[PDB]
Design a protein around this ligand. Structure first.
Ligand SMILES: NC(=O)c1ccc[n+]([C@@H]2O[C@H](COP(=O)([O-])OP(=O)(O)OC[C@H]3O[C@@H](n4cnc5c(N)ncnc54)[C@H](OP(=O)(O)O)[C@@H]3O)[C@@H](O)[C@H]2O)c1
Ligand SMILES: Cc1nc(N)nc2[nH]cc(CCc3ccc(C(=O)N[C@@H](CCC(=O)O)C(=O)O)cc3)c12
Length: 205
């Protein structure tokens, strides 16, 4: 069902809040630009065939402006145990995280003109929970928002806290840029009265 590592990408407050009222209680144009660049990036040589995957829960799928669904240049897969007959000219649907992985590994591969590069779990507290339990998840691309904004949905596992400090390690910034390709902003970024920062955390499998 799985060969490649999974990577989770999330934007969260220091209180682990990730959403409110089914939206994102923060408008950060540069933060979204980073999300797009990371989830889309593939090495030059492999730029011909290779392509990244973004897995998301239904509710997170709905949260994306119709203007941006599907995420261009990336294989989208919406996890949902209930079929509501909506595909929309591509969009794969999967019963579960592991079901989605086998669908992809099946759909693509040898007889495939398009190959898979990286797989990103982009969200939903529910899908985040499942991913944190998955034996192939070894990387978290986190954007820390330094402000206790009000949220009603939170990240399931406190990976930045001491209790998890022997498992999850924060990577050097230079290594972040390397894995990500281009140079990324170092230190806190201010935009709309919000100060945030990019961090990459890894786990040994
Ligand atoms: N800060 C961030 O980076 C970030 C990222 C993602 C989402 N969010 C926010 O989170 C909120 C959405 O809440 P949410 O946590 O409910 O979204 P979610 O986890 O993405 O969506 C859950 C829904 O997705 C499907 N799903 C997710 N995990 C599943 C699993 N493990 N097995 C089977 N089905 C699964 C479901 O299908 P069914 O409906 O058929 O049951 C379920 O109702 C919004 O406010 C959104 O903007 C923030
Ligand atoms: C916002 C955000 N930031 C980070 N760092 N991780 C995250 N993981 C999951 C989400 C969920 C929300 C989310 C994701 C993508 C778009 C979106 O429309 N993206 C377009 C960008 C359009 C643009 O440049 O405005 C895309 O192409 O990726 C909107 C909301 C998220």
């Amino acid at each position: 069902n799985q060969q490649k590592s999974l990577t989770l990408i999330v934007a969260l407050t220091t209180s682990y809040g990730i959403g409110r009222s089914n939206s994102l209680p923060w408008k950060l144009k540069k933060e979204i630009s980073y999300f797009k660049r990371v989830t889309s990036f593939v090495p030059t040589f492999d730029s011909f065939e290779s392509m990244n995957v973004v897995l998301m829960g239904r509710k997170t799928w709905e949260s994306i402006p119709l203007q941006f669904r599907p995420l261009k240049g990336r294989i989208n897969v919406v996890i949902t145990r209930n079929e509501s007959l909506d595909l929309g000219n591509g969009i794969h649907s999967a019963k579960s995280l592991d079901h989605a992985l086998e669908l992809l590994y099946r759909t693509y591969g040898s007889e495939s003109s398009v190959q898979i590069n990286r797989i990103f779990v982009i969200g939903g507290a529910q899908l985040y929970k499942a991913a944190m339990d998955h034996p192939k998840l070894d990387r978290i691309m986190a954007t820390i928002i330094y402000k206790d904004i009000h949220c009603d949905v939170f990240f399931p596992l406190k990976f930045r806290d001491k209790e998890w400090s022997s498992v999850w390690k924060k990577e050097k910034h230079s290594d972040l840029e390397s894995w990500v390709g281009t140079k990324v902003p170092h230190g806190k970024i201010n935009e709309d009265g919000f100060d945030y920062e990019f961090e990459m955390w890894t786990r040994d499998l």
